[PDB]
Symmetry: C3
Subunit: 348 residues, 3 copies
């Protein structure tokens, strides 16, 4: 019974236990894959207050010495600080959490020059603004926002806004209400554009999941009266509206948003970010309650991809565009997304 509150809490614990027994990273335990994963752990804790989530969060923060990863120009490398900030706020204990290494990262990232800001890169991926790919909008903005809030330094939000607007102005497709992953996927309108197998624009489900899930985390903690809030609220509603509209019949979004018929089964990690962001918006009254059944159908479909031992399956491995997954494929960020969806499904 996938909608039963104890079912959902037990499924969430089992997903945590499975992933804790299978640690994984792309390049380091402090990298974006674990940052996204522990961000989901953090929200699962926020909803259930179960000590086991907080144990895992504290475990990893201590093991990593409260360090972000080390490419200071690189948004991916600060995603882990969300978990650090969350524990610092929610574990009231002196001589324990340390936010200095996060502060140091953010100061360099935001205020120091680097090759990406300088716009001197000449590659296909076009690495000529700080956040030149859409996934960055999950990795850095929610951390800068929670940092600004906890430290009472609103100026970080201004710097966040400047870079978020650059990404938005480059990659947000105003006609389709979805983000291209990077400049390669923006159309010039001719026979050399990158297209899906059915000829449509490429909009990657997890790619857009990062953005919309980043919006839900952002709006969760951004001040009510922040001077640019309306910009974020409206982007969130526009993207939510499209994602709802293109949700496949069986409830799971495919890895390709506009060419879902290219895949035989839906993909869990992008679907989990959408279900998180959607359930969040319904719970906050930003999205009409009549959308509850669509958000529940996704939840049901993802719940049925979870193995008896807790593994969250049907997750596409690391990438930058639509690719297949299978029933045993997993990743820590995919467990993280499932934990995010569950943490909001529980509040409906």
């Amino acid at each position: 019974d996938v909608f039963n509150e104890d079912y959902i809490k037990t499924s969430m614990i089992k997903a945590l236990e499975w992933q804790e027994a299978h640690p994984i990273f792309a390049i380091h335990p402090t990298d974006w894959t674990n940052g996204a994963y522990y961000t989901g752990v953090a929200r699962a804790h926020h909803t259930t207050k179960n000590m086991m989530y907080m144990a895992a969060l504290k475990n990893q923060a201590v093991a990593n010495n409260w360090q972000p990863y080390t490419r200071l120009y690189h948004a991916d490398d600060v995603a882990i600080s969300y978990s650090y900030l969350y524990v610092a706020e929610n574990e009231k204990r002196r001589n324990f959490s340390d936010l200095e290494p996060t502060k140091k990262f953010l100061d360099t990232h935001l205020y120091e020059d680097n090759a990406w800001k300088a716009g001197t890169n000449r590659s296909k991926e076009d690495k000529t603004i700080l956040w030149w790919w859409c996934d960055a909008l999950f990795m850095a903005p929610p951390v800068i926002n929670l940092y600004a809030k906890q430290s009472e330094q609103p100026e970080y939000l201004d710097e966040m806004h400047k870079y978020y607007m650059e990404t938005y102005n480059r990659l947000y497709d105003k006609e389709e209400k979805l983000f291209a992953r990077d400049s390669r996927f923006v159309w010039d309108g001719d026979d050399e554009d990158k297209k899906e197998p059915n000829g449509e624009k490429v909009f990657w489900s997890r790619g857009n999941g990062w953005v919309i899930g980043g919006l839900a985390l952002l709006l969760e903690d951004m001040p009510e009266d922040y001077k640019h809030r309306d910009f974020y609220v409206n982007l969130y509603k526009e993207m939510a509206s499209r994602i709802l509209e293109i949700q496949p019949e069986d409830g799971l979004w495919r890895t390709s948003l506009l060419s879902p018929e290219s895949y035989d089964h839906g993909e869990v990690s992008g679907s989990a970010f959408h279900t998180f962001a959607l359930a969040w918006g319904i719970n906050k009254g930003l999205i009409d309650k009549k959308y509850t059944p669509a958000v529940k159908k996704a939840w049901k479909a993802m719940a049925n991809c979870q193995h008896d031992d807790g593994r969250v399956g049907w997750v596409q491995n690391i990438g930058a565009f639509p690719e297949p997954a299978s029933k045993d494929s997993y990743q820590n960020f995919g467990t993280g997304a499932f934990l995010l969806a569950g943490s909001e499904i529980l509040k409906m």
Copy 2:
């Protein structure tokens, strides 16, 4: 059959496995929560000799670089050295274990001045002697005894005894035969005496379980001829009689010793310390064998609170109400201590 030797062994291993897969700490892997946990893992090893226990003990000792935690005035931060001392004795490898950080801790703890010894603290907790709260008598005394034993330096015991007597003189209720947690729970006869709803003095089950289970560990290894040994033996027998006398009908002590009716279910960690200390005393001949069925009733109750995947449940946190899913690493340690003695009965 919860009394079958093979049932108990497989239960204890599952409790270890489940806790190893769910590591936890209050402030650090070397903190008292882990020191109590791995002291239960040490005693499980000592009874069963299963290589799985010793693997887990060596893994954390090496991962922690043999260090206790860092507040050298604080008995909680040396609890972890019990496991280190146990590995140094029982893992037969020269040049593997390092007891120097434990020695550095004990020398500063016992011989150098600090603000708790100075007596100037003005808090409600009254942190005006080294071991100003009763739980400290599980954390430091058993480690100082093992250290004194392996170093053959009995002066460490004399120093242990001095501080142990301060805690006993402040907190042991000679009429009730149980310990108050700290000065706040000691009655002065005035307006803010702390009472249970039934009017009785407040004695915490796990608080007393730290003390009596610490007494069993101490007497396990203290020399038969130590000058002060009788004092610990009679303390142990007095607390044991009272703890037996107040045991609830279903086997499990509640979090409150003199007001069990304030809780709707028994609590596992305190009960496990009592069960360990009581079983140990029966096996050593300090407690009369007629008390076996009661010790056994407690083991059965706790064995039924273990989940199928090994989780030891009904453990009150360091607080949310204790529930069937609630666990702690020191609760799994206490369950392993109990099992380690039930096995030898």
Copy 3:
């Protein structure tokens, strides 16, 4: 149903998950027990390509900061570098893998003097050549061989061969086609001779498992035209023919190879090394096809010693249905990794 491809892949994943949940070492996570274990994990990845094996390999290499253990004269302390070289080759990723600590170890191990090379030791074990005990032939040669291959430095193979020949000249019993563990077990025809309860020479199953397993790994990656290759092929063929010949009825080698009657039950870790090496050679064409049933029978007997939760049991410590070791799980994964390919 132990021969089905699926049963085999899921058994190996269970063995991995059980071992990963039960970390163990003799003295350090980078010691030989773990080197053996991760070497099985790397071969399981090589056959299956399952991302789970690679996550475990990457995890331990970063946790250990790519360091072998610390006695540079000692072959045991470099066994963990096989997994590091494996990751470096197979995880295509910049500024991630580090082979400098392995290179430093091998340069000192192979090219600098030490007390064992100097020949001054005067004990029963006779620690007077670099690799004075046969297990060292699993620990160091495969790592040297893989380092030589990835660095394009065949001079490392030449130095490997010098030390391998020493251990061969001392410890390989040419009439029995098996290795003695060290000089204590070699006969000189006096009362000091060590014998089994039945009068036979002592040949240890795991001891020999290390050698023949080492030889499969070595032959897997040594260039085909390497000038010393025939020595290694011939040795591998001789050992494999004998180990086939002495394999007990129920499929499992006992701890003692010439006195299996001194034990009630076979032992898994040694068996799993034999099974890996024998299955490897059948697959490579070095061993006759007709020996498939004998290797299949080993795999089945081993498969039946795995608990439901993945534990590989009946492994003698450094033996009972419960007894396990990390290098026993490693040997099980090695065997599986070749059985899959038959």
